[PDB]
Amino acid sequence: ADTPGEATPPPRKKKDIRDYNDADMARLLEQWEKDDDIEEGDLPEHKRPSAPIDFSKLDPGKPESILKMTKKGKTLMMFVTVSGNPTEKETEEITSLWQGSLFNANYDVQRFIVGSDRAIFMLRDGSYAWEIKDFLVSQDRCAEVTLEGQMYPGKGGGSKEKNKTKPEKAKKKEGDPKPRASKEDNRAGSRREDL
């Protein structure tokens, strides 16, 4: 099964991400369906050690909010394209790991839900993720998940500051590249809602 690729549609919702994080939650809804279906998920060696090899060259340096992170711990990488899948508690953790990849300032996250099936893409990379993305859904019958618990972050700096700030959390909600965006997504509403 081969699919086209050259004239992709605009960011309707798949490229919006409710609350720029709530999207992962919506995935939990698919879990219930996977309970009876059960496509795939378990892979050989979920470890898969990742390293700081992301672009990270968009903005002049990086925000201070990231400093509060104090070294996330382990990167994040998951690719699946099918109705239902074991990622309930896994998706909820994506928010914790996402903090690390976020440093790249070009993370990649897409959430799509359709009666036909469900597919989610999340990787520390940004431009490379977009390419593989189209290739993922192209399968329409594949499931993969990679998550470690004893490795290094994707930032590649490990500030290790351990200091919370007032505007710190405010900036995160604003946006990595720029403000004016989260609001729209928030208005959408996911998790047993969808707009």
Swiss-Prot record:
<dbReference type="GO" id="GO:0005783">
    <property type="term" value="C:endoplasmic reticulum"/>
</dbReference>
<dbReference type="GO" id="GO:0007498">
    <property type="term" value="P:mesoderm development"/>
</dbReference>
<comment type="similarity">
    <text>Belongs to the MESD family.</text>
</comment>
<dbReference type="GO" id="GO:0001503">
    <property type="term" value="P:ossification"/>
</dbReference>
<feature type="region of interest" description="Chaperone domain">
    <location>
        <begin position="1"/>
        <end position="126"/>
    </location>
</feature>
<keyword id="KW-0732">Signal</keyword>
<feature type="short sequence motif" description="Prevents secretion from ER">
    <location>
        <begin position="192"/>
        <end position="195"/>
    </location>
</feature>
<dbReference type="GO" id="GO:0006457">
    <property type="term" value="P:protein folding"/>
</dbReference>
<keyword id="KW-0143">Chaperone</keyword>
<feature type="region of interest" description="Disordered">
    <location>
        <begin position="1"/>
        <end position="20"/>
    </location>
</feature>
<dbReference type="Pfam" id="PF10185">
    <property type="entry name" value="Mesd"/>
</dbReference>
<dbReference type="GO" id="GO:0034394">
    <property type="term" value="P:protein localization to cell surface"/>
</dbReference>
<protein>
    <recommendedName>
        <fullName>LRP chaperone MESD</fullName>
    </recommendedName>
</protein>
<dbReference type="GO" id="GO:0016055">
    <property type="term" value="P:Wnt signaling pathway"/>
</dbReference>
<feature type="glycosylation site" description="N-linked (GlcNAc...) asparagine">
    <location>
        <position position="163"/>
    </location>
</feature>
<keyword id="KW-0256">Endoplasmic reticulum</keyword>
<feature type="region of interest" description="Disordered">
    <location>
        <begin position="149"/>
        <end position="195"/>
    </location>
</feature>
<dbReference type="GO" id="GO:0044183">
    <property type="term" value="F:protein folding chaperone"/>
</dbReference>
<dbReference type="GO" id="GO:0030177">
    <property type="term" value="P:positive regulation of Wnt signaling pathway"/>
</dbReference>
<dbReference type="GO" id="GO:0006909">
    <property type="term" value="P:phagocytosis"/>
</dbReference>
<keyword id="KW-0879">Wnt signaling pathway</keyword>
<feature type="region of interest" description="Escort domain">
    <location>
        <begin position="127"/>
        <end position="166"/>
    </location>
</feature>
<comment type="subunit">
    <text>Monomer. Interacts with LRP5; the interaction prevents LRP5 from forming aggregates and chaperones LRP6 to the plasma membrane. Interacts with LRP6; the interaction prevents LRP6 from forming aggregates and chaperones LRP6 to the plasma membrane. Interacts with LRP4; the interaction promotes glycosylation of LRP4 and its cell-surface expression.</text>
</comment>
<dbReference type="GO" id="GO:0050750">
    <property type="term" value="F:low-density lipoprotein particle receptor binding"/>
</dbReference>
<dbReference type="GO" id="GO:0042802">
    <property type="term" value="F:identical protein binding"/>
</dbReference>
<dbReference type="GO" id="GO:1904395">
    <property type="term" value="P:positive regulation of skeletal muscle acetylcholine-gated channel clustering"/>
</dbReference>
<comment type="function">
    <text>Chaperone specifically assisting the folding of beta-propeller/EGF modules within the family of low-density lipoprotein receptors (LDLRs). Acts as a modulator of the Wnt pathway through chaperoning the coreceptors of the canonical Wnt pathway, LRP5 and LRP6, to the plasma membrane. Essential for specification of embryonic polarity and mesoderm induction. Plays an essential role in neuromuscular junction (NMJ) formation by promoting cell-surface expression of LRP4. May regulate phagocytosis of apoptotic retinal pigment epithelium (RPE) cells.</text>
</comment>
<feature type="compositionally biased region" description="Basic and acidic residues">
    <location>
        <begin position="158"/>
        <end position="195"/>
    </location>
</feature>
<keyword id="KW-0325">Glycoprotein</keyword>
<dbReference type="GO" id="GO:0072659">
    <property type="term" value="P:protein localization to plasma membrane"/>
</dbReference>
<dbReference type="GO" id="GO:0005886">
    <property type="term" value="C:plasma membrane"/>
</dbReference>
<dbReference type="InterPro" id="IPR019330">
    <property type="entry name" value="MESD"/>
</dbReference>
